[PDB]
């Protein structure tokens, strides 16, 4: 006979979802500004329409997205292998190979074959092909059902070939699906270790060894992925709010007057711009107003030089004597003004040059000759008991604000500073006024040293540990606490600061007014430095590098306070114990989670329906009744549902039965299916308007065998509601097979196919003594036994034949002794073919590939390579018919036992 598939079909295998991921450059010479590039591409094997999208990028034209271009690829005859995404290992499924015939008026006769694959259990074996001939009417299609059972996990391949009779047309499809184990995805937490190198670990580093994934529910030989999550833990510190700029609108003053009156109007404007620039409240205050006040600051510096005496000193008039306080206060205001506006620096350093030559006794004391006409600007220095020590600290602070600007100009400045600092330490422990200890508390903390006792007296003189207070006008005390805040911010102390700033804010002092020169300048210079240097966070900076033996490199991550990489995940498919080294400052969290396949109940099939499918030979060659009963598992009746019925090979439904079912009230069989021919009708859909949840809705129709076939593939029935194909239920039906399942032998979620031949079919008369020795002496033949059948444990899945090892003719890899028992397994389809009788003796040999269980409970399988021959008893050999066989068996034993197998 002719196998039409001899056409040497190379099946189509390239079915990418996307391709042509290419990069081309239009280098061809342009014609009217348009370059045309011709490009040869090789279309893939898919029979579909491709959408080609092109995007161009040009130096002079930019980005352009072309309109999509479509290419349709088709044939007149082809296979569409409708393969599911995944299939559970050892679960029986029915795939669909749809064959299309788009000939206009030609009815095709096709020979279609499912190719054998050892990874699957089907009707196709190594010695038998699953070929069948089908008929496809023109402009129609036919679905060819194939029943398979995947036997090994991973990407497995299904190939279907087809060739048409009387035309030189052929096609083949070779797609692949994923075989997933019977478990369910599950995630477990491996470790949660908090990283803190300055609290854990030693010498500044923290080593954390992570144990590998501790799974004990994992399906054997399945992949696991371990996800390493390094994540920094951000922390924040409380800070006191800045003063609302709406309360500071009155500090913008046009400076006027003489040498002392000009500085009174210049002070609130310079300190307001300075405080608003640091806090950046100009958006909520008026961005336009910033330039106007900036000109008033220039107006103040311009009119103050009119009263700068030629001796680089400052007085109220050009004929007035110079002041030690007023000169030191112009240095204090001009120094803080340099950051926003500048004109001349020799004016600032010229006043510091005069402030040391004339008003610096080598004792370090600054003494005031007092030509200050305005006692308003003096502040707390006025009406001070220790007016001598409070003034030495005032001028010393003025020199420091100008020290970084006049270091090269005034080279004798560090000498007077050291001398002024020497005078303060001596009489610091003798002061009794809170103002003197506060201004001289910021005067010795600034780039200086306050002794332990001096710091203790500075902190203990704060009444209620938050404020500096003394009998006198409150503007002296507000000025004092402002000096004490600049000291706590110069010493970088932040445990005494919060209650100090809170008191300054609760004072609700917004500057301005009479005699407010010092109080307005200091309260906003201190509160600006608090906003300039403040702990908002705790300085996170972790250098965490993980050394994994899974790779040859160490991945590191600098977890700054920067928000670019707060968390960074590192996946590692290898499940191995790795080391986490973490050093630096701050805190962090490490999370290690491993996903895996946990073995559990395989119960995901038929979770929404009950489905009972029975096939009965109830009484043109053969005629059976296919009965289908289904029931929805919900609290209410299900909506419109589908019965996807598949015929067993060689059978077609009775047309008159379908027309009576289509006339049902809650059923619908489409007119398309009723008008179909009797033959080439192996699939059918019965639509249900509803399926009850309380009772089983049953329908039944007869099926006739219009074509006799040697092997009948089990039919299938599939139920699902229209809105969810995933929630389906499939039952197989087949006469002479248990529940429609193909013959397979399973043990501990490992199955092997049993559709092969029952045993070696060679006849007992066509075999000779030399043929037995040549077969049995092959290395593949592991065991050769003489057995005695003791018991036959009949079961519906497979028959178990308990054999007593009468003689060990050739011992194999299984150490079995004479008298022991071994179980020989064979599917029930071979029960009539083997014809085994109890208490009879048999000669048996087979392959080591037919072993089944573990060594303590080792079972034998009777496969296509297992020799099973009847051994007649000693008295039975007296017959002339058994004389030939007994002479062979008796000689076969003596030749194997006494002399073994050469080579």
């Amino acid at each position, epitope marked *: 006979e002719d196998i*039409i598939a*001899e*056409e*040497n079909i190379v099946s189509r295998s390239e079915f990418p979802e996307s391709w042509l991921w290419n990069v081309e450059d239009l280098k061809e010479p342009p014609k009217n500004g348009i370059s045309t590039k011709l490009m040869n591409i090789f279309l893939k094997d898919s029979i579909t329409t491709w959408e080609i999208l092109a995007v161009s990028m040009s130096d002079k034209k930019g980005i352009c997205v072309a309109d999509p271009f479509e290419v349709t690829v088709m044939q*007149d005859f082809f296979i569409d292998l409708r393969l599911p995404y995944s299939v559970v290992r050892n679960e029986q499924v029915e795939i669909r190979a749809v064959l299309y015939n788009y*000939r206009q008026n*030609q009815e095709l006769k096709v020979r279609v074959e499912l190719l054998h694959n050892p990874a699957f259990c089907s009707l196709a074996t190594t010695k038998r092909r699953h070929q069948q001939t089908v008929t496809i009417p023109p402009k129609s299609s036919l679905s060819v059902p194939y029943v398979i059972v995947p036997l090994k996990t991973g990407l497995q391949e299904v190939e279907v070939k087809a060739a048409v009779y*009387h*035309h*030189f*047309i*052929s096609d083949g499809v070779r797609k692949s699906l994923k075989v997933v184990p019977e478990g369910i995805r599950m995630n477990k937490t491996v470790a949660v270790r908090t990283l803190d190198p300055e609290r854990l670990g030693r010498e500044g580093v923290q080593k954390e060894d992570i144990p590998p994934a501790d799974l004990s529910d994992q399906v054997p030989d399945t992949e696991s992925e371990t996800r390493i999550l390094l994540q920094g833990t951000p922390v924040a510190q409380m800070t006191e709010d800045a003063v609302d700029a709406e309360r500071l609108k009155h500090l913008i003053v046009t400076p006027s007057g003489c040498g002392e009156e000009n500085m009174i109007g210049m002070t609130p404007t310079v300190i307001a711009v300075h405080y608003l620039d640091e806090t950046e409240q100009w958006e909520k205050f008026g961005l336009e107003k910033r330039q106007g006040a900036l000109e008033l600051i220039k107006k103040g510096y311009t009119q103050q030089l009119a009263f700068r005496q030629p001796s680089s000193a400052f007085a109220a008039f050009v004929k007035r004597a110079p002041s030690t306080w007023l000169t030191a206060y112009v240095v204090k205001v001009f120094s803080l003004a340099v950051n926003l506006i500048a004109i001349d620096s020799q004016v600032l350093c010229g006043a510091v040059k005069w402030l040391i030559l004339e008003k610096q006794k080598p004792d370090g004391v600054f003494q005031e000759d007092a030509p200050v006409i305005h006692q308003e600007m003096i502040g707390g220095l006025r009406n001070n008991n220790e007016k001598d020590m409070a003034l030495t600290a005032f001028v010393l602070i003025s020199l420091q604000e100008a020290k970084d600007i006049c270091e090269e100009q005034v080279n004798s400045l560090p000498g007077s500073i050291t001398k002024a600092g020497d005078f303060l330490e001596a009489n610091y422990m003798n002061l009794q006024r809170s103002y003197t200890v506060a201004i001289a508390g910021y005067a010795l903390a600034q780039m200086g040293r306050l002794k332990g006792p001096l710091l203790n007296k500075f902190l203990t003189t704060a009444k209620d540990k938050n404020r500096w207070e003394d009998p006198g006008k409150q503007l002296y005390n507000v000025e004092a606490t402002s000096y004490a805040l600049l000291a706590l911010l110069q010493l970088k102390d932040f445990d005494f600061v919060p209650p100090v700033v809170r008191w300054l804010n609760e004072q609700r002092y917004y500057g301005g007014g009479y005699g407010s020169t010092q109080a307005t300048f200091m309260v906003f210079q201190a509160l600006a430095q608090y906003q300039k240097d403040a702990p908002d966070h705790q300085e996170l900076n972790l250098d965490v590098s993980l050394q994994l033996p899974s790779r040859s490199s160490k991945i590191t991550h600098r977890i700054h306070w920067e928000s670019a990489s707060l968390l960074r995940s590192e996946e590692t498919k290898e499940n191995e114990g790795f080391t986490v080294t973490a050093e630096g400052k701050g805190q962090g969290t490490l999370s290690v989670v491993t996903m895996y396949h946990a073995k559990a109940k395989d119960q995901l099939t038929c979770n929404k329906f009950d489905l009972k499918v029975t096939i009965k030979p109830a009484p043109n060659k053969n005629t059976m009744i296919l009965e289908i009963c289904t029931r929805y598992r919900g609290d209410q009746d299900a909506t419109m549902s589908i019965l996807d019925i598949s015929m067993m090979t060689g059978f077609a439904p009775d047309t008159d039965d379908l027309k009576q079912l289509a006339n049902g009230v809650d059923r619908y069989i489409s007119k398309y299916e009723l008008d179909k021919a009797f033959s080439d009708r192996n699939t059918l859909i019965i639509y249900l308007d509803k399926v009850s949840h309380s009772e089983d809705d049953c329908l039944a129709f007869k099926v006739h065998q219009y074509f006799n076939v040697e092997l009948i593939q089990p039919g299938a029935v599939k139920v699902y509601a229209y809105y969810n194909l995933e929630e389906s239920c499939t039952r197989f039906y087949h006469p002479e097979k248990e529940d429609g399942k193909l013959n397979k032998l399973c043990r501990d979620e490992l199955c092997r196919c049993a559709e092969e031949n029952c045993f070696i079919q060679k006849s007992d008369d066509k075999v000779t003594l030399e043929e037995r020795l040549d077969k049995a002496c092959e290395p593949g033949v592991d065991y050769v036994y003489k057995t005695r059948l003791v018991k036959v444990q009949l079961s519906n899945d497979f028959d178990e034949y308990i054999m007593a090892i009468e003689q060990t003719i050739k011992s194999g890899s299984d150490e079995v002794q004479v008298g022991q028992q071994r179980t020989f397994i064979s599917p029930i389809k071979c029960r009539e073919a083997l014809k085994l009788e109890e208490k009879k003796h048999y000669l048996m040999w087979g392959l080591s590939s037919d072993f089944w269980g573990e060594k303590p409970n080792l079972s034998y399988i009777i496969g296509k390579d297992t020799w099973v021959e009847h051994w007649p008893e000693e008295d039975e050999c007296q017959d002339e018919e058994n004389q030939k066989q007994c002479q062979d068996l008796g000689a076969f034993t003596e030749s194997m036992v006494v002399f073994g197998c050469p080579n």
Partner: nanobody
Amino acid sequence: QVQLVETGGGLVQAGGSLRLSCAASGSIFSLNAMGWFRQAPGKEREFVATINRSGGRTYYADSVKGRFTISRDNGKNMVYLQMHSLKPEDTAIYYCAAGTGWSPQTDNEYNYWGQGTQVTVSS
């Protein structure tokens, strides 16, 4: 497209033999049907032989059923027609044609034909 050139013809005696070689323009691979056709003087163009794409299937006309043998070489872009045991009724112009594979025994599925060659078998 593709065109064909027929060679190997000529004059022969009644009993002898000769093979005709068909040369293809482009790659003959992926072309399912390659057929030979002949037209005798005073008669219509009739079917002779077709060959499969891989060469594993052929079809012959009943008149030349067991006397001709069609073969192809997909690597050389060549088709051949070995003619044995000639008869005086085989005198015709022999045409080489490219087909689609559908109905390979009819000329209605051949869109690319050749010049043809004269094979005169004299009595």
